[PDB]
UniProtKB/Swiss-Prot annotation:
InterPro entries: Glyco_hydro_22, Glyco_hydro_22_CS, Glyco_hydro_22_lys, Lysozyme-like_dom_sf. It comes from the Eukaryota. Substrate binds at residue 101. Pfam families: Lys. Keywords: Allergen, Antimicrobial, Bacteriolytic enzyme, Disulfide bond, Glycosidase, Hydrolase, Secreted, Signal. The active site is at residues 35, 52. Lysozymes have primarily a bacteriolytic function; those in tissues and body fluids are associated with the monocyte-macrophage system and enhance the activity of immunoagents. Has bacteriolytic activity against M.luteus. It is found in: Secreted. GO terms for cellular component: cytoplasm; endoplasmic reticulum; extracellular space. Belongs to the glycosyl hydrolase 22 family. This is Lysozyme C. In the egg white and polymorphonuclear leukocytes. Its EC number is 3.2.1.17. It comes from Gallus gallus (Chicken).
Amino acid sequence: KVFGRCELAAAMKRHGLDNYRGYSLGNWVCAAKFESNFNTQATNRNTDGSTDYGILQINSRWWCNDGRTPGSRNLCNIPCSALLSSDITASVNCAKKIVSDGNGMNAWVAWRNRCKGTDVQAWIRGCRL
Ligand SMILES: [Cl-]
Ligand code: NA
Ligand code: NA
């Protein structure tokens, strides 16, 4: 599924991401835009052999099991394919564990390089939330 911007904002809010660990909703929408272009089916392979999955590009070395990342932890206890669903619940629940791990949203490279320090509220401007 490819979400619209406000559609994704509303889904993320319903799933408790607004201000989760202090990160306003716009941060999460911005991260999703630049991680996946709002596409739940996005995948990208990394140089170390891990793969990133879904709207928030969650990595198979630490967070989910894709059966082909040796020595990987499965800290969200989910198959990585569950992160590609049109229902973002599994991605959101795993993202909550990631953002609580110490480094906050700096875990998402695109957030650090393209959202951090910008006016992220623009990502939810105009939405009926
Ligand atoms: Cl980047
Ligand atoms: Na893909
Ligand atoms: Na992989």
